[PDB]
Structure 1
Amino acid sequence: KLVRLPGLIDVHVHLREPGGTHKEDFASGTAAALAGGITMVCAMPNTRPPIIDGPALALAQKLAEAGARCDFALFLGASSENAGTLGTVAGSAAGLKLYLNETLSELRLDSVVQWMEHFETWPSHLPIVAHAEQQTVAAVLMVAQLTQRSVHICHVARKEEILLIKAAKARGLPVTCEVAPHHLFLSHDDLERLGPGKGEVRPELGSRQDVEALWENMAVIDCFASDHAPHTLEEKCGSRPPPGFPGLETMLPLLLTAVSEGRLSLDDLLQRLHHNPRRIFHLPPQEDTYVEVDLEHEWTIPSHMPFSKAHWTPFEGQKVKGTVRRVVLRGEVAYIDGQVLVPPGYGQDVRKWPQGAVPQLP
């Protein structure tokens, strides 16, 4: 007996196109999404070239429309040069992404004043998300308060961070956050097995106490999101390993296993992979869209999942219970039992749908 879920949303994926298509492209990354029970993705802007201006966004929009197999929105990226220049295209993006710690030279901000400038100039009704670790979480919260608006904190990974966000929510501040599966299901205990190359990710893997704090404080977590960050094994195992794990194909099986064990409820899962992504990012419903999962099937995660071009996974060897059997996307069978059945280009930019525009005062 299968369970019907709504179309799940992953608000944090790196699909590498343009410029890193050996790691992933729209077609392969959205195949991975569908196989993971995800029907809508929000793609991050740290591509090559990065999505930091209108021409780059225009290119990325067309590449996605031609390659995506599920629906999508594209983030814009903040740079040291683009504050005050994005107003005409801002509403066409998923939101604005700030990279406040390590990142590409093009997305590096060297001063909190530049963060300020972005919070002041980006349209106040549109989402802002920040990669902000440890004290950077408190710093960007301060900037959000000074500019009187909300912020969403990406991939919270530490006890310190979730407790700071908890304290901010207790003071009524408009902050939301997401957590990625590797920060719920992997820890320092796994670094022996992974090694120092494969184990590289930002935010880094936490201690057992970090992991336990995130579970303890599930009420504080608004969204789950993969931070799908595909890199090839050659890159992960080489001399300058880039941070990041692939995660689209493993996220839902890992979380269904947790539901099975009573660690969170099905509703808790659906708030975090459907309702809260919708409401934080103003993402539209998808008509005639659903995912059928089998909650009894026990399997072991292999050395690589079928679809991501990353061709490896840090969850190799973990035993899971739960599998995606079928995905229907806008009335068409998109995935069944290991086969993706919609072509590249079936997916659409949800920000172009009438119901996908963010409401604003005239």
Structure 2
Amino acid sequence: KLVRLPGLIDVHVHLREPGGTHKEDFASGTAAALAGGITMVCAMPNTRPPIIDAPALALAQKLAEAGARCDFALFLGASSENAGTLGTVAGSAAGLTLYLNETFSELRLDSVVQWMEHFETWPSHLPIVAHAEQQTVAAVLMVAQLTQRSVHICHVARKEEILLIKAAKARGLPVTCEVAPHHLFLSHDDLERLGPGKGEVRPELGSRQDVEALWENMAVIDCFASDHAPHTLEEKCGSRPPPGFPGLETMLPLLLTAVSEGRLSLDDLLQRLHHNPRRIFHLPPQEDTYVEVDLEHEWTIPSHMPFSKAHWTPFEGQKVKGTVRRVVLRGEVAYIDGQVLVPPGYGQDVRKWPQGAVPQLP
């Protein structure tokens, strides 16, 4: 007996197109999404060129419309030069992404004053997400308060960070957060097996105490999101390993295993992969869209999942219980038992749907 779930949403993926298409492209990354039970993705802007201006967004929209197999929204990225320039295209984006720790020079902000300028100029009704680790979480929360608006914290990975967010929520501050599967299911204990190249990720893998703290503080976690960050094995094991793990194809199987073990409920999962993503990012429903899963099937994660061009996975060898059997997207069978059945281009930009515009005062 299969369980029917709504179409799940991953608010944090890197699809690499334009500019890094040997790692992933819209077609392969959205195939990976569908195979993971995900029918809508929000794509981060740290491509090449990065999505930091209107021409780059226009290019990315057309590449996604031509290549995506599931529905999507595209983030814009904050730079040291673009505050106050994104007003005409802001509402067409998923939101604005601030890279506040390590990143590429084009997305680097050199001063908290630049963070303030983005919070002051980006339209107040539209989402802002931050890559903000350790004390940077507190710092960006301060900027949000000074500018009297909300912020969403990407991939919370540490006891320190979840407890700080917990204290902020206790004070009624408008902050939400997401956690990635590797910060719930991997830890420092896995670095010996992974090795130092494969194991590179930002935020880095936490201690056993970090992992336990995230589980203990599930109530503080608004969303799960993969931070699907594909790189090839050659890149991960070469002389300058880039940080990141692929994760679209493994996220739901890992979390269904946890549900089966009573670590969280099916509802807890659907709040974090469906309802809260919808409400934080003002993402529209998808008509005639659902995912059928088998919660009984036990399997072991192999050395690579079928679709991501990363062609490796840090979860290799983990035993899971839970499988995606079928996905229907807007009335068409999109995935069945390992076969993707919608072509590149089937997916659409949800911000162009009337119901996908973010409501605002005139």
**Structure 1 unaligned regions, length at least 5:** none
Superposed CA offset, 1:246-291 (max 9, x none) = 0000000000000000000000000000000000000000000000
Q: 1:86 maps to which residue?
A: 86
- Deviations along 1:182-214, one digit per CA (max 9) or x if unpaired, are 000000000000000000000000000000000
Post-superposition offset of 1:313: 0.1
CA apart distance, 1:30: 0.0
In 2, the alpha carbon distance for the partners of 1:341 and 1:56 equals 30
- Does residue 46 in structure 1 map to residue 43 in structure 2? no
Distance 2:111 2:187 in 1: 32
Which residue matches 2:345?
Answer: 345
Tell me the distance in 2 between the aligned counterparts of 1:342 and 1:46: 27
Note the 1:249-264 alignment, pairs <5 A.
Answer: 249-264=249-264
2-side partners of 1:104 and 1:117: how far apart?
A: 20
Once the 2 structures are TM-superposed, how far is the Cα of residue 138 of structure 1 from its aligned partner? 0.1
- Number of matched residues? 362
Q: Secondary structure at the match of 1:333?
A: strand
- Secondary structure of 1:48's match? coil
Q: What is the root-mean-square deviation of aligned Cα atoms in Å?
A: 0.1
Q: Please list the CA deviations of residues 110-168 of structure 1 after superposition, one character each: whole Å capped at 9, or x if unmatched.
A: 00000000000000000000000000000000000000000000000000000000000
Could you tell me which residue of structure 2 aligns to residue 160 of structure 1?
160
Q: Distance in 2 between matches of 1:110 and 1:340?
A: 43
| Shift of residue 228, structure 1, vs aligned partner | 0.0
TM-score by length of 1: 1.00
SS in 1 for 2:312: coil
Per the TM alignment, residue 298 of structure 1 is displaced from its structure 2 partner at its CA by 0.0
* CA shift for structure 1 position 236: 0.1
User: Residue 316 of structure 1: CA displacement?
Assistant: 0.1
Tell me the alpha carbon deviations over residues 34-53 of structure 1, each in whole angstroms, 9 at most, x when there is no partner.
00000000000000000000
2:103 and 2:349 map into 1 onto residues whose CA distance is 26
Per the TM alignment, residue 318 of structure 1 is displaced from its structure 2 partner at its CA by: 0.1
Q: Which runs of 4+ in 1 moved over 3 A?
A: none
How big is the shift at 1:3?
A: 0.1
> What's the TM-score, normalizing by structure 2?
1.00
What is the distance in 2 between the residues matched to 1:349 and 1:268? Answer: 27
Aligned counterparts of 2:166 and 2:141: Cα–Cα separation in 1: 12
Question: Which residue pairs with 2:266 in the alignment?
Answer: 266
Q: Which secondary structure does the structure 1 equivalent of 2:130 belong to?
A: strand
1:12-68 per-position Cα deviation (integer Å, ceiling 9, x unaligned): 000000000000000000000000000000000000000000000000000000000
- Structure 2: give runs of 5+ residues left out of the alignment: none
